[PDB]
Amino acid sequence: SPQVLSAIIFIYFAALTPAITFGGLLGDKTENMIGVSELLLSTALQGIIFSLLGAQPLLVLGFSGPLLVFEEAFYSFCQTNNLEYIVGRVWIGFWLILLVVLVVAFEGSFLVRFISRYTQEIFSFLISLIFIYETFYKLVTIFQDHPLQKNYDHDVLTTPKPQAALPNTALLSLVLMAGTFFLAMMLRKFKNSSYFPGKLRRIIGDFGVPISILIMVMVDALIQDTYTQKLSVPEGLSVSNPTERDWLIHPLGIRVEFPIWMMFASALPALLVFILIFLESQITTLIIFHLDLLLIIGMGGVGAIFGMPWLSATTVKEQRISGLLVAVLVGVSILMGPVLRHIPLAVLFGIFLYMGVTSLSGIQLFDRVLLLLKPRKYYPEVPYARRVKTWRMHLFTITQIVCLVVLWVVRSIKQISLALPFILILTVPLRRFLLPFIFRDMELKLLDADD
Amino acid sequence: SPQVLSAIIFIYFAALTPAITFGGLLGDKTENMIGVSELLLSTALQGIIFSLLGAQPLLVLGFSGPLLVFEEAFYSFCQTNNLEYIVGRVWIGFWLILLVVLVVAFEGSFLVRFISRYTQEIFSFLISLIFIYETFYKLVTIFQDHPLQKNYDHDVLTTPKPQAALPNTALLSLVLMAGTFFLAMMLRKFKNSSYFPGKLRRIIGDFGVPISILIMVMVDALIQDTYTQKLSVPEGLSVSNPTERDWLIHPLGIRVEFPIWMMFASALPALLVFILIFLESQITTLIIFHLDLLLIIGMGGVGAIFGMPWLSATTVKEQRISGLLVAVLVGVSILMGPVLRHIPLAVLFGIFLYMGVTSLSGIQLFDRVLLLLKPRKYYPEVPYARRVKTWRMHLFTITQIVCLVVLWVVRSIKQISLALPFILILTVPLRRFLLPFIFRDMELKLLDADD
């Protein structure tokens, strides 16, 4: 049917846009171990093996920011002490497996009843802040790798990586990253404009991210005499750096024996995986049970066997075939390596920043963070700003900002890390115990009352 | 008084912002003959010698876009046949002088009664289109002067001008031009926002252009190892390229005798100067007369004696001292050459584009040019869109677009030029004779009825 023909490409683009950029981000946050080929394959089988078994086969299992934060933190920790990033993570997966049985025997979704706005708008807000900060850290690395000079050197080999500073890169990349973001923002506003009649508009506006990558892929295509960093994509059905990893992974290590005292001490880096996948797994279920989430947990654990990052829930009869088709198309997408390698990394990072910005404006916390600076004579009329004293509003925002700073500090120091979720989850008692001691109940039902 | 102390700096910045950028534009549109030192001095004496004698001493005599268009057209024509740009223009000034007497004897401001919206919104709209097109022509010249490569050469001398292509310029300039414009737009929106209380906001917002040049002057200051094109400013009270021109100009030429058959055939390039200065001289007088304009005409003619471009009217008791002070400060401003030469040209061109954009949104013609593309179900409610048939509105815009294209073609071809004003003024009969034959009087009083 014509409806399906359009819907399947719509969902295909919506699901393919984040995967490639996250694969590139992982390719840079690690040496080259985890990239696009395995990640794009990670969600390929996952689609079908969730569509076959699932309460809601209309959902999409994409890759989310918090998971990436956890893996980059793990890589940072994995380098403080000599450890194999791939191999150790594998054991984490096995630990997840034994957590599956303990919840299959008896449900453990009680915490869903204790999750509120104070928690999911301080956590998501932090994610929208790590995305913006992440792209500004790359400019520093670029300016140090290719510093601005006027002499340079002749004929530097660059096939594996630029061996020395060369011109037209430190600030060409800046143009490329700042161009995609600008075009994406303009098309986002286009979708919410009055140019062109109705549907004939939103057909293109709804494809802003998929469309605002090709313009400046062509830009790099038309500029070939200047080198730019691009994606690291191996051949079809192949693992990037096949001399460093294989499809089948040996738990005892590939090159160096994995330390003995790590086999059974990997429980801690696994319950946190479970917590992160759990918290995000209910935000996307409020659009409208236990087995649906337990399958996701076990299947993410399975993904740790051959070396694929685990997936997480995302946004949204013939229900089965939709997931079937999206999964098979994603799987076949990895055969376009020769044309997929022309995409430069700065374009992906610009799309990443665009993701980090749009997700920020939808959070209701920011709408009052700005009001803090706003003078108290232009406040918008919302039924939580006229029934509450003005000098009490700013106090709540300060209570949230202090927690935000506390969370940020932990994410900054390299030594003490991998505990951001542990320090974040204990904010729920702060909301359930400390907050009811300072604010009145009839006032608190308007600041952090989730709908 | 404190009021004066703030007002004088306010007007000083408002009058100094356009002069520097126009001087740079002239420095590039000519070899180096006319630049900033003489132009910034051109309006220095002019301020006092108009404040002393003038009907409204509160006005400001700045440099406008159409005049610059005329001078660049004259330079283009001056190169088709071997002629001295400075010397020939001098004679034009003398011609303007004899036009002064003919109008002093009897007034000639009749055409003011025949100027309407159809004329000053098709002319100003074009000006806002050259400004945008002008800055996009420079990128082509830059990419041809410094093409993108990866080998380049070592140690190129650049003191008078870059003798060969060097890195970090073809697209650094792009960052610099696109940065000032973005910041200026953001601060323009800042002035129309609700951040910060009332006046404490608009004090900075009203200085958007003066403030959004220093940030990225500092950017170039912090990047000194990469060369960028900058202003050509000579020492204090000196003419740029003093081996090519002097303060006192000899009408028979400096290096080559000026052709004889040009002395008395320069009337045509002078009546057009008069027409351009006339048409703009009434748009700024409708905010609420002959000698006031005749003085401007004669004084612009005087400016052609020592080699300064003529000035034109612009936007807006102690009235005298304001002009006195603004003039003396402008005159003294030319002593800051050592610090004024650090400003790069791309910054000035970005400010030029900003000027070309803001002036575009204020024209009521554009507000319906966009409606042409708008579907006929979101039209704004203005008392000229509900009393007129929709299919008749687009016709008027087409009648204006065809004239716009006709005007653009003339400005494009190099051979046939210097006649844009001649072909534009005869649009007034088109408005007074052709238009009343196709549209009804009771319908025409809502499309081009000036207030």
Author numbering:
A (entry chain A), B (entry chain B): 420 to 707, 720 to 747, 775 to 909
Give the text the authors published on this PDB structure.
Anion exchanger 1 (AE1, band 3) is a major membrane protein of red blood cells and plays a key role in acid-base homeostasis, urine acidification, red blood cell shape regulation, and removal of carbon dioxide during respiration. AE1, a member of the solute carrier ion transport family 4 (SLC4), mediates the exchange of HCO3− with Cl− across plasma membranes. Mammalian erythrocyte AE1 is a ~100 kD integral transmembrane glycoprotein consisting of an N-terminal cytoplasmic domain (CD, residues 1 to 360 in human AE1) and a C-terminal trans-membrane domain (TMD, residues 361 to 911 in human AE1). Here we present the cryoEM structures of full-length bovine AE1 with its TMD captured in both IF and OF conformations.
The classes without CD and fully connected CD are both monomers in IF state. Particles from these two classes were combined and refined using a soft mask of the TM region. The final reconstruction of the IF state was resolved at 4.4 Å. The IF state features an elongated TM11, which incorporates residues from intracellular loop 5 (IL5) between TMs 10 and 11, and partially unfolded TM10. In contrast, the core domain shows a remarkable difference between the OF human and bovine AE1 on one hand and the IF bovine AE1 on the other hand. This difference comes from rigid rotation of the core domain ~20° with respect to the gate domain followed by diagonal downward displacement of the core with <5 Å along the z axis and small lateral motion in the XY plane. Further inspection of the IF structure of bovine AE1 TMD reveals that, due to the rotation and downward motion of the core domain, the ion coordination site becomes open to the cytoplasm and fully closed to the extracellular side, i.e., it is in the IF open state not previously observed in AE1. IL5 between TM10 and TM11, which assumes an antiparallel β-hairpin conformation in the OF state, loses this β-hairpin structure and part of it folds into the elongated α-helix of TM11 in the IF state. The concerted movement of TMs 10 and 11 and the β-hairpin to α-helix transition of IL5 opens a large cavity at the intracellular side and exposes residues R748 and E699 (analogous to residues R730 and E681 in human AE1) to the intracellular solution. At the extracellular side, the downward movement and rotation of TMs 1 and 3 occludes the large permeation cavity seen in the OF state and shields the binding pocket residues I546, F550, E699, and T745-S749 at the previously identified central ion binding site S1 of AE127 from the extracellular solution. The IF conformation is stabilized by several salt bridges between the residues of TMs 1, 3, 5, and 13 (D447-K557, K448-E553, E491-R869), which aid further in the occlusion of the OF cavity.
